[PDB]
Symmetry: D2
Subunit: 245 residues, 4 copies
């Protein structure tokens, strides 16, 4: 089996990605953040639903934390074949209100994380002549959003990274792609009051519904498959038609 | 079982798509150009390999030809759930040398075809609340190419169609997407002398190899699957890194 | 002077482009669908144009028009492909006649008008071709499978041609406008503009045809020689990518 | 007269921008970095060629440095109407060899700078109902580049910032746009030896020549003009056809 690492693999989209990659026959390793005290309960729950994951702590905003995390995974589980950079946060405020701490938290967590997690896995992928790296961006990287100068900068920057790295390692059988989801039915979105969902969110989506986390997971599984080896440097929109270009 | 129509389904990329959709479980119908003299021989060969197709003649440049073809498919096989607009030609000439006849041949065959074949299938898909339309473009629609003012205009036009149609019918469970392949190992390209392939074509492709038509077919199958419902109005690049944006 | 041709140059956006290019120092020629009142009015205002009737969907009409222009004025340095129509209808109801009318008028015209001027530009080592597209080519629009196909196709043409002739000092670019304050848009009642159109535009107003004309004048200038194969959005933020 | 601030205003492209904005009738203030010991000499040189500039020190990677710089400019010169975020560096290394120091240097200098410089000028532009913000990206943000996971991430991130801010403040008469140059005839590009220029650089450029810094300056001046008020959230390519999409 291919070994896959999914950052934020216990969160909304992350769990759906982890579940799908497991179901596709990959051996899945998730990370959990310093704020996450529920790793044991999550592992037990996942096993109750028939699935075995490995879990390791990491701070994706810290270079050394990432290096050490990957070192342990290679030691305990094995060489990393697939990396899904899914960890990310929001700190939404208009530029007028936005302070440096909240600019920084988003750039460091959402963009530095791509450098920090991808650098320690690439050499092995290249050496073996096979790898898949998938970066989870956002429709808001593509179109921008009010309150998201920080988030859009980070998420658009992710795709700049995708393209440069794709060029460096495409010849070695490693693909690097960006996935840009629209609104998904994760906890923080399904919690939105119905009046706002009906008048402000759903009318932006031609499909007329939220995307399922499982649908984004399916796209990630496709990119991670043996038959997706000719797709590289791309940014795939999965947004119900919310944005087209 | 979903019923799929694949235009240009009997050779090159079309054949690969038709095989993949069949193996995905769909009932596949192919179109062939009216003066294609090998339809029965193709069906025999495919049936000898365990695949049961239907095949109908059509001129995709002719509006009435297309309407009537779909009517026969509906009568004989059943309602069309999936359409892959794959038929197309090249008539490469720099603008300096390009004539109106060859401008028209490419616009009519490559762009008018999308209107001609899609119009007769959409109402049924909308009525039933499910459909998939996949338009096959080219990397050259994205980046342009010398000698292809006609082909790039047609192929870029196809994606304009994709986006407008996607908006009209998204809310009714029908997706419309464009797939843009780079260099593929179809008969016309593998016929390239090996030294020309190595010195002139491969250096344009970071992957360092031609794409397999089966790889493109796999992407089309993903888009046609039940789990790709939140992808619409998109243009997915499958080009080994030849073009990024 | 450079000589400029503006198709559809006597009304709407075309008129604003024609005026701006004249005022930039170009000798301007306009085309119209089958002009003295407009020509005389422009003359009174200190602007000398030539006007020719042309069917931009018809290849021979375009070739013959360009012949007259080279005779009467001189070789064409600048071409703005602005002529275009809409025939809006959802795919369900759109007939072949109205698909064709839009592809032929909006897309074939680019081939028909550009082919007869490009060789001269290349021979001389300088030229400017500007294709007027639409935001709706970039984003799609309901009832515009035809219009978006034609307008997106225009930019495929831009990119291929740009590659053919960049080395010889000719640039080819697309301009994609949003909502403009032309006659048929300003005829919209203010209540409908305020509640239906303006909320789509972050700028909160219609674009002026003169603003689009200024961008076209920039592209046609001596200092825009390193811009080619591009699609420039001028839409008040209505679409970004 | 409008007051313009050009970061990196004494460097290759920045000087050209500064000269053109002055010639267009604006009052131009340049910044100079901590490592620049030539401000006095540059001001003298510029005045000997007929132009009066103001110059202030700043470290664009440092939020407080930029806030203080802007305070001084407003005190000494006047409120800022036009901001050109032109300062940027390269630290080119493949991801395999790229260390965190050089990742950070490029993200903080090239992307954090857009937040650090733009935040302190935006309120005033909004208050007066007129402003122009122009962010200098790169063709390599659009296409990616080998050795530039850092630079392309930063440069693509700049445009994410552009789009989100443009949405926040378009209604207030302020525009925000990205300009993405190709190869320019600045000191370090013209220094490249002739064999590499001829075989590696120029063949990537359909125009067959380097871009003049003055050409990019012309575009920036256009964007800063009173007539460009309906252009916002855009990314304008000025690259001699090197990349198209
Ligand atoms: N939901 C949507 O509609 C949507 C749309 C577009 C894009 N996205 C993207 O989807 C991704 C996942 O977010 P989500 O929607 O699933 O929200 P979420 O449940 O809040 O997940 C965010 C994940 O980020 C991880 N994380 C944050 N900071 C971290 C750090 N310093 N170190 C390690 N891990 C860290 C968290 O790990 P722990 O759980 O261990 O704390 C968490 O699993 C994000 O990149 C987001 O930008 C979501
Ligand atoms: N030349 C090209 O081909 C090309 C192509 C695409 C994009 N660009 C972009 O154009 C911009 C200008 O670069 P250039 O080509 O003109 O090269 P350059 O002469 O090296 O200019 C870079 C400028 O950045 C300033 N700078 C760097 N770090 C700084 C800091 N920490 N604080 C304040 N200022 C700082 C420098 O200021 P001092 O001079 O005061 O030290 C300098 O003027 C960059 O953003 C670059 O990415 C250039």
């Amino acid at each position: 089996k291919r070994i896959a690492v999914v950052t934020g693999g216990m969160g909304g989209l992350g769990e759906a990605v982890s579940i799908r990659l497991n179901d596709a026959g990959h051996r899945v390793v998730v990370t959990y953040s310093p704020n996450n005290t529920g790793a044991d309960r999550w592992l037990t729950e996942m096993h109750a639903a028939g699935r075995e994951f490995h879990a390791y702590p990491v701070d994706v905003a810290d270079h050394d934390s990432c290096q050490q995390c990957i070192e342990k995974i290679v030691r305990d589980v094995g060489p990393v074949d697939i990396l899904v950079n899914n960890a990310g946060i929001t700190r939404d405020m208009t530029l007028r209100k936005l302070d440096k701490v909240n600019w920084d938290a988003v750039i460091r967590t959402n963009l530095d994380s791509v450098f920090n997690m991808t650098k320690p896995v690439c050499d092995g992928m290249v050496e073996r002549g096979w790898g898949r790296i998938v970066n989870i961006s956002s429709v808001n990287g593509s179109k921008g959003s009010v309150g998201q100068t920080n988030y859009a900068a980070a998420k658009a920057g992710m795709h700049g990274f995708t393209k440069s790295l794709a060029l460096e390692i495409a010849r070695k059988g490693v693909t690097v792609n960006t996935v840009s989801p629209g609104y998904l039915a994760t906890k923080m979105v399904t919690a939105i009051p119905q009046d706002i969902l009906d008048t402000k969110i759903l009318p932006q989506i031609p499909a007329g519904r939220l995307g399922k986390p499982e649908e984004v997971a399916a796209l990630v599984a496709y990119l991670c498959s043996e038959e997706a080896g000719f797709v590289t440097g791309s940014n795939i929109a999965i947004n119900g038609g919310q944005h087209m270009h």
